[PDB]
Design a protein around this ligand. Structure first.
Ligand SMILES: [Mg+2]
Ligand SMILES: [Mg+2]
Lengths: 321, 135
């Protein structure tokens, strides 16, 4: 399976990840270790490695790119958790609670620094153009998301843009950068690139679905956390639209008037309306991106590496397939 | 105002105009004066001012401004990385990214020390972090 072939590399990047976090500073080392210890599926290094294996070539750059992408990913998590007040991280407590605010913000910048250090060896402007551009896009998406809190309506284009920047682009950068550090065929680079984009889009939709459909156990936080923090997502958008087809715009009215001080009763109503009217269309959307990802995988040369990607595509999108 | 200062201010003013949650604080005056006379390219000077302002923003972050300030320090860090990417300034990149991890390390250790001369000195090292390697 994919865990079999990547196993040797996974432990290698994991080893290097711990090397990168070492610090003559006591707290930072502890803090960096704290989040690196947490259960991460290391899905991004996986996409990097597999991207470089699409063509025959061995490079030190490949595995060290995977390391930097993880460090960046984790840097955003530490900052995110503090910003969004998320006190728990998959069973383990988050950095700002286990230490403090100052350590939380320092550790994030520290992880980013080391991540940048790790790839400073790659003398390639295009590589840095892509990576620095995606990091910027992530930031940009965060600004808009923050401004969209409790601001209805949120256009369909703005939503796609939001989930693209917040989840899709980084995964796409994993496939893009992984392909660069192996001089991959351009037509083949386009397909693994678009695959990374589509899989990320699909995954983030599913996650937006689960916020409404799953239990606080699989979520690690209350059901309907997005809307309670002001985030208007496609499931809600789709539910409102369906209700309007039945000549019922009460949900629209409510969401329009929703503010940060709204009552729990209003949220419970929204959540149940979404479960009843907004789930199917969101699943349908997610499936479109899932299918599109399949196409891009099918347009690249038949090989062993193709099968691994195809198997991970099945797992990550289990909720829709 | 130097050429490089117009460049960064133009981009920062464009961000504030576009993203209401981006907060642009004033650049450190002393750091500007020094950077003005640094023997490096326009792009490196922008990166320096970007990352210097980024780290100084850390100290102003509360619960009342975190959904603004945190993200703002993060774009400033990203801009820092952008400025040194095309063309890629390998040496400046190796040096300044080192400064980033080190300044966070110094600030962490600074928290657990009350000694006068020890605090005066570490603060000095922190305040001149990104400009020393060029002097
Ligand atoms: Mg967030
Ligand atoms: Mg979510």
């Amino acid at each position: 399976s994919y865990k079999a072939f990547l196993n040797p590399y996974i432990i290698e990047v994991e080893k290097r990840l711990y090397e990168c976090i070492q610090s003559d500073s006591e707290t930072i080392n502890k803090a960096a270790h704290h989040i690196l210890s947490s259960g991460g599926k290391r899905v991004r290094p996986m996409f990097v490695l597999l991207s470089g294996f699409l063509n025959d070539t061995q490079k030190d750059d490949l595995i060290r790119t995977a390391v930097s992408l993880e460090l960046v990913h984790m840097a955003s998590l530490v900052h995110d958790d503090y910003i969004d007040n998320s006190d728990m991280r998959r069973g383990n407590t988050s950095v700002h609670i286990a230490f403090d605010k100052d350590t939380a913000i320092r550790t994030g910048h520290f992880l980013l620094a080391r991540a940048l250090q790790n790839i400073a060896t790659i003398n390639n402007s295009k590589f840095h153009q892509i990576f620095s551009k995606t990091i910027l896009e992530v930031c940009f998406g965060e600004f808009d998301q923050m401004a969209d809190r409790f601001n209805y309506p949120v256009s369909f284009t703005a939503y796609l843009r939001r989930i693209n920047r917040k989840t899709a682009i980084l995964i796409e950068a994993s496939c893009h950068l992984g392909a660069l550090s192996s001089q991959l065929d351009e037509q083949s680079t386009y397909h693994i690139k678009q695959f990374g984009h589509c899989i990320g889009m699909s995954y983030q939709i599913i996650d937006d679905i689960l916020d409404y459909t799953s239990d606080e156990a699989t979520l690690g936080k209350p059901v309907g956390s997005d809307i309670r923090n002001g985030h208007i997502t496609y499931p809600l958008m789709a539910a409102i639209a369906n209700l309007k087809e039945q000549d019922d715009d009460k949900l629209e009215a409510v969401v329009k008037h929703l503010t940060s001080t709204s009552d729990d009763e209003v949220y419970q109503y929204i959540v149940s309306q979404v479960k009843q009217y907004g789930i199917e269309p969101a699943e349908l959307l997610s499936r479109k991106y899932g299918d599109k990802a399949k196409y891009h995988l099918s347009q690249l040369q038949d090989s062993n590496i193709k099968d691994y990607l195809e198997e991970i595509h099945e797992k990550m999108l289990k909720r829709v397939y | 105002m130097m050429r490089y200062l117009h460049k960064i201010e133009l981009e920062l003013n464009r961000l504030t105009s576009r993203y209401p949650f981006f907060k642009k604080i004033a650049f450190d005056a002393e750091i500007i004066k020094l950077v003005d006379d640094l023997n490096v390219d326009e792009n490196v000077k922008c990166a320096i001012v970007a990352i210097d302002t980024s780290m100084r923003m850390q100290d102003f972050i509360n619960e009342d401004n975190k959904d603004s300030f945190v993200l703002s320090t993060d774009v400033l860090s990203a801009l820092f990385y952008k400025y040194l990417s095309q063309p890629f300034y390998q040496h400046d990149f190796l040096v300044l990214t080192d400064c980033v991890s080190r300044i966070n390390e110094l600030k962490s250790i600074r928290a657990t020390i009350t000694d006068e001369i020890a605090l005066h000195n570490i603060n000095k090292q922190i305040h001149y972090m990104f400009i020393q390697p060029y002097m």
